[PDB]
RNA sequence: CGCAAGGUUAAAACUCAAAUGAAUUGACGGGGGCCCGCACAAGCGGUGGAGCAUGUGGUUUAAUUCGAAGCAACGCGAAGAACCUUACCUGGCCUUGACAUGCUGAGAACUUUCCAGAGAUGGAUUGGUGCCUUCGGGAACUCAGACACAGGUGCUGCAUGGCUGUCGUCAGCUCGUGUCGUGAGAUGUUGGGUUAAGUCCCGUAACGAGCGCAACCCUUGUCCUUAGUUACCAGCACCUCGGGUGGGCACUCUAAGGAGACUGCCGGUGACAAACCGGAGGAAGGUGGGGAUGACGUCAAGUCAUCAUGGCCCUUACGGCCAGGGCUACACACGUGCUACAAUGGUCGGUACAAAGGGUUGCCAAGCCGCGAGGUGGAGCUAAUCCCAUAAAACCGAUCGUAGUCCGGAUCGCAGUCUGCAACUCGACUGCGUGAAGUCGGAAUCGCUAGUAAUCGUGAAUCAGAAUGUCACGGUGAAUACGUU
RNA sequence: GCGGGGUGGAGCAGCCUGGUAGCUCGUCGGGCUCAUAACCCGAAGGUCGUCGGUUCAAAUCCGGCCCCCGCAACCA
RNA sequence: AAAAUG
């Protein structure tokens, strides 16, 4: 959880979000059955133009306080070993211990 | 259990015959909770018994269990240096359990088309005693006289 | 063995959550992040003031913060030139507008967080820990406090081996859910490492 | 002295800082006595044999990145390694730096649609000179320089905090005052019963108290009150025969508040006590079933790699950026699993009944085109309202006839679908064809006492994709317990 | 020249009386144990000295040869 | 009935 590594994933977040439209248009044109092989191929070229650091697959979500790559809960934003610490203090609304 | 507070549940759900031993035999032949499979298999076996056997099949069944139940059972006890065996009279409730278990486990080992006619075959064999279950019963019985020395 | 957090096990039963609002699949994570950031920032900034409970409420697109402190004079100085800067800063952090209400708490020696902080800052000043434990326990027991336990762990003094000490007085039943056991932990940073302080305070039974 | 064995009298050098007696607390015993626990015993089903998944040890490699090591490591951190993750290797590329503050100068961010480069990067690139103005100026943002710095998943868990396992959910562990002993200490807390319990009763130099046990919390099983849409349909009517429609507050159901179970009543035993064994009633009877809850402490137990922190260490590098590769390697060994070795079965046809949950950077219906995984399509839904979504084992009829087979599916060849910049290393499924080991498994070893075992299916987390793993929910549904050596 | 023999890496059964090679110690792997030793269970490893003949067929029956012995004997 | 050692 080195801060350089957090910085380089946050910058990945900006790089992914800052296009947000050329990916959609190009992939929609590619997946459109009636667009001709020319618009297939130019769209492939266009997709290969932009940096690889733009896709959502490259984006590994992390804890917002520690950045632990493992043990994530996307309903919250915290990691495995901070969600419990915050919950025992009652900070998380409507969270208790369950028996049933 | 050391406490001896564990009571027993009573099961009696004979569908049509309204008997008692039949249901316990059902449970013995039931495997992995396949109760209806046991229903149809045992009832086909009993139908074959009824068509082969002139009389009703339930008294033939109880007579067959009468010839498989062991009167005495041998049980190993170690004297502290030697491996002995001791013959003891079987608990009256335990006789039916041994009878059912032996009959089922011996009907399982025939090797013919299905175990319905296997169960019929050993039900008729045990009706007088030319089967293999009666063979094991008499072997276990004769082990008692073979070890009558200790008894006490 | 280990013991469950006494505040968490009593959540809903006798204790109350420190952040009461409602959110949905989108804004829930953002609201939790804002709450955690605001709480740590407020604690760090008003460390000098004796702040214990930061209660957060969220009405429609708004936010209300109430502060439980033993010293309200520092925050409320010469008719409001302090809380307003805080309001503006919190609105810089919290997108929604904020609202502040400074709540003063009597009997600070009956609040676990304050006792823990005082003991920790005493140990930071190279004071013997047994004297601090005795003084805190006696101060707590002069008024109310049907029971109190204080535990301190670490390299007490300057020894190069860690150990744990604790002193109790009265009754502190942790296995009874009716009892509202106030509980707190804190860390004291010394030249030889970290010292952990835990405080349990028993107020009374809740009946009916 | 004695026949001999040997007896009697009896030193020193040297060497050590102890040797020793009695009693106390604990631990232990192939010492004793009571009691408990799937601990045995009585049963059911497995592992160890075969194929495959997954982790570990060892070997090789450029790396196979770290950590976890009897029970208490080995489907463990990891609730998801194609790139990223990533901490390792090869090569390329930076030096106050990807990031914080402090000084100086130039200026907007933005949008610039191009070239070289595996890429970091370097060089053109129309456009705007900004906001507010003490109109002087100023805040923010980008770049250049300079130091104080920044940085480290680098070592020490035997310097620490926090968190966790374990004995063990076993019934114990202590204190004040008093008393006994020269003291370490002891009584309380021993004893007769009884209980799941240091639970309770009676006695009693002890009298009282605290942390444990029990109770308060959640859920499940009965009933009552309120509630009736999107949930329900007993009655009435219409109906195109779909609670479909009008309609109702009957019912189920959903969710809030209450009643009820307390050895309460009767019989016997019992020191006429605690309690035990029966009976009635009751949906439930003896803490009704399950959960959460883990005392004083032990193992210098685990973690410095989630985090924080005392020290020590590098600063052109042990700090950063980018391409590929490895963590999925392979003469072997071990743990945990899935599938089988078949007839209580494998195929074919139509057929009936669940619970739980997830969905507006989402579910994705109808229709149409494909044997097929899928594709176009766009409906409904912020959801008891629409979608995921057809449960399966079970039952009836037909066939196979016990044969390594109408079993079993590994392996392999060819051709495909889908997400992803990209499926060689190294993804999941689909179609045709090929078709293995396996005939129920040695020494040894494991889990389980009633909705239990066994067996059948469904859902969620992580997640673009990837589950035989984890967590969770229902269907069918047993056998056995005389007893404590 | 008398008598006896030859088979897993070492040592014994199987011959006789024809068709079937097992056992012990070793090596390897795995069990038991907190761990080691002891102990238990698997696996590999022998076409039987060789040649010829008998014999339907041979580790087995007969001989040639070779080797081993107990050998008397030999013993610089 | 077996059980040597650290
Ligand atoms: Mg850090
Ligand atoms: Mg990903
Ligand atoms: Mg003892
Ligand atoms: Mg047993
Ligand atoms: Mg196996
Ligand atoms: Mg194996
Ligand atoms: Mg490793
Ligand atoms: Mg496990
Ligand atoms: Mg430790
Ligand atoms: Mg620790
Ligand atoms: Mg005295
Ligand atoms: Mg004592
Ligand atoms: Mg005691
Ligand atoms: Mg008690
Ligand atoms: Mg309790
Ligand atoms: Mg009763
Ligand atoms: Mg250690
Ligand atoms: Mg890389
Ligand atoms: Mg790995
Ligand atoms: Mg088949
Ligand atoms: Mg061995
Ligand atoms: Mg020795």
From Swiss-Prot, chain A:
SUPFAM superfamilies in alphabetical order: Glucocorticoid receptor-like (DNA-binding domain)
Q: What InterPro entries does the record tag this protein with?
A: Ribosomal_uS14 (IPR001209), Ribosomal_uS14_bac/plastid (IPR023036), Ribosomal_uS14_CS (IPR018271)
User: Does the entry feature the keyword Iron, yes or no?
Assistant: no
GO BP:
translation
A single GO cellular-component term from the record reads:
small ribosomal subunit
Q: Which UniProt keywords apply?
A: Ribonucleoprotein, Ribosomal protein, RNA-binding, rRNA-binding
Answer yes or no on keyword rRNA-binding: yes
Q: Name one GO molecular function term.
A: structural constituent of ribosome
User: Which Gene3D superfamilies does the entry mention?
Assistant: 1.10.287.1480
State the protein's purpose. Answer: Binds 16S rRNA, required for the assembly of 30S particles and may also be responsible for determining the conformation of the 16S rRNA at the A site.
PANTHER family under this entry?
30S RIBOSOMAL PROTEIN S14 (PTHR19836), SMALL RIBOSOMAL SUBUNIT PROTEIN US14M (PTHR19836:SF19)
Q: How does it assemble?
A: Part of the 30S ribosomal subunit. Contacts proteins S3 and S10.
- Spell out the family assignment given in the record's similarity comment: Belongs to the universal ribosomal protein uS14 family.
Q: What is this protein called?
A: Small ribosomal subunit protein uS14
From Swiss-Prot, chain B:
Q: What does this protein do?
A: One of the primary rRNA binding proteins, it binds directly to 16S rRNA where it nucleates assembly of the head domain of the 30S subunit. Is located at the subunit interface close to the decoding center, probably blocks exit of the E-site tRNA.
Origin organism of this chain?
Pseudomonas aeruginosa (strain ATCC 15692 / DSM 22644 / CIP 104116 / JCM 14847 / LMG 12228 / 1C / PRS 101 / PAO1)
The GO cellular component terms are:
cytosolic small ribosomal subunit; ribosome
Enumerate the Pfam families for this protein.
Ribosomal_S7
Name the SUPFAM superfamilies for this protein.
Ribosomal protein S7
Family statement? Belongs to the universal ribosomal protein uS7 family.
Q: Which NCBIfam families match?
A: rpsG_bact
Identify the keywords attached in UniProt to this record, alphabetized: Ribonucleoprotein, Ribosomal protein, RNA-binding, rRNA-binding, tRNA-binding
**PROSITE patterns for the chain:** RIBOSOMAL_S7
Known partners and oligomeric status:
Part of the 30S ribosomal subunit. Contacts proteins S9 and S11.
Record-annotated disulphide pairs: none
Give any single GO term for biological process: ribosomal small subunit assembly
HAMAP family xrefs? Ribosomal_uS7_B (MF_00480_B)
Name the encoding gene, please: rpsG
Q: Can you name this protein?
A: Small ribosomal subunit protein uS7
GO MF annotations in UniProt? mRNA binding; rRNA binding; structural constituent of ribosome; tRNA binding
From Swiss-Prot, chain C:
- Keyword rRNA-binding annotated: yes
Q: Which domain of life is it from?
A: Bacteria
PROSITE patterns in UniProt:
KH_TYPE_2, RIBOSOMAL_S3
Positions of the KH type-2 domain: 38-106
The record's keywords, sorted A to Z, are: Ribonucleoprotein, Ribosomal protein, RNA-binding, rRNA-binding
> CDD domains given for it?
KH-II_30S_S3
Spell out the disulfide connections.
Answer: none
Q: Name one GO biological process term.
A: translation
User: What would you give as a GO molecular function for this chain, any one?
Assistant: structural constituent of ribosome
Recorded GO cellular component terms are: cytosolic small ribosomal subunit
Q: Which family does it belong to?
A: Belongs to the universal ribosomal protein uS3 family.
What does this protein do, in the record's words? Binds the lower part of the 30S subunit head. Binds mRNA in the 70S ribosome, positioning it for translation.
Return the HAMAP family for the record.
Ribosomal_uS3_B
Subunit relationships: Part of the 30S ribosomal subunit. Forms a tight complex with proteins S10 and S14.
Q: Can you name this protein?
A: Small ribosomal subunit protein uS3
Naturally occurring in which organism (per UniProt) = Pseudomonas aeruginosa (strain ATCC 15692 / DSM 22644 / CIP 104116 / JCM 14847 / LMG 12228 / 1C / PRS 101 / PAO1)
